[PDB]
């Protein structure tokens, strides 16, 4: 029981993560060679990763009942990477229980009214548990079409270097070497 | 029929893998029983029949590991998983030609 005794303030805090839908991802890409052929994370492979963060499942204290999820700011959703002809052949449906009122729309036609952010919210929404926390978690996914967003100051940092920045890894290893100078 | 017995016509790579290991585990049971008798200079009519008219997993074709003969099918072949107790039964040889 001692493992849990302590200050759990920072274990439950909301971290503001960031990812660009255009930056190549060696881990979430199916093409891994050559270096120039690596593609960004596909729609479903990016949503599968985000849904894991919104559920807080990346934390060692995850519990499905506690809403220990985090925020995820997705940028460049206009350049959402998709394979095949999904952009023009995939269809989204709707019905309000009135016979004949079946609304259909393609991915590209849906990206003209509400942009690529709406296509990613539907992918993440289906990957989340269908319960009373689905709308709270999906609201923590802030997707934008370009590189601009109001959370450029919220993104988690480490020594002034935003995570995902060019030199963010060096700033982390420098802070841990200073923490070892103690009993 | 209106009663749904949802059984796919083919097996998955996970079922085929376990099938390979079951065909491989029965080969070790006959090889152990045969080598144990050979050391004593003995033989069993059932063990001599198996080694004579039954192949090993390393000698069977893929179509004999995941399929069986069925005269009611278009091409006289039927998924082995469509056999009763197919997981605890021996089935490796089909009629010649089919």
């Amino acid at each position: 029981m001692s493992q849990t005794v302590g200050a759990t303030r920072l274990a439950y805090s909301r971290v503001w993560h960031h990812i660009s839908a255009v930056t190549p991802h060696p881990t979430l890409s199916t093409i891994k060679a050559p270096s120039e052929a690596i593609t960004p994370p596909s729609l479903g492979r990016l949503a599968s990763r985000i849904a894991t963060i919104l559920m807080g499942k990346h934390k060692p204290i995850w519990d499905p009942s506690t809403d220990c999820g985090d925020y995820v700011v997705v940028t460049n959703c206009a350049g959402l990477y998709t394979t095949g002809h999904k952009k023009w052949r995939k269809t989204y449906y709707r019905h309000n229980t009135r016979p004949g009122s079946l609304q259909a729309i393609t991915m590209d036609a849906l990206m003209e009214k509400h942009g690529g952010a709406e296509v990613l919210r539907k992918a993440v929404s289906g990957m989340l548990p269908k319960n009373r926390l689905r709308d709270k978690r999906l609201a923590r996914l802030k997707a934008f079409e370009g590189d601009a967003h109001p959370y450029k100051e919220n993104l988690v940092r480490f020594g002034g270097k935003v995570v995902g920045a060019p030199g963010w890894e060096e700033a982390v290893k420098a802070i841990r070497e200073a923490d070892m100078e103690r009993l | 029929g209106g009663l749904l017995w949802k059984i796919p016509w083919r097996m998955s790579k996970f079922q085929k893998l376990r099938q390979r290991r079951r065909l491989r585990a029965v080969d070790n049971v006959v090889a152990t029983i045969e080598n144990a008798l050979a050391k004593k200079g003995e033989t069993v009519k059932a063990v001599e029949r198996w080694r004579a008219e039954m192949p090993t997993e390393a000698e069977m074709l893929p179509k004999d590991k995941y399929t069986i003969f069925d005269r009611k099918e278009k091409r006289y072949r039927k998924g082995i998983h469509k056999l009763p107790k197919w997981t605890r039964v021996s089935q490796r040889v089909n009629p010649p030609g089919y």
Partner: protein, 46 residues
């Protein structure tokens, strides 16, 4: 135009082509013939 399921060349000038294939549909196989316009055929419905 005669829409068939088994399109065949009826002369030496008939040509097999796949038209109307774009990012939204797969298209159909046509039998275009400049000599005789009665050799026009299609494979598939919309």
């Amino acid at each position: 135009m005669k829409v068939h399921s088994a399109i065949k060349k009826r002369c030496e000038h008939c040509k097999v082509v796949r038209r109307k294939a774009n990012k939204r549909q797969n298209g159909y196989l046509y039998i275009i013939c400049p000599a005789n316009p009665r050799h026009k055929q299609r494979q598939g419905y919309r």
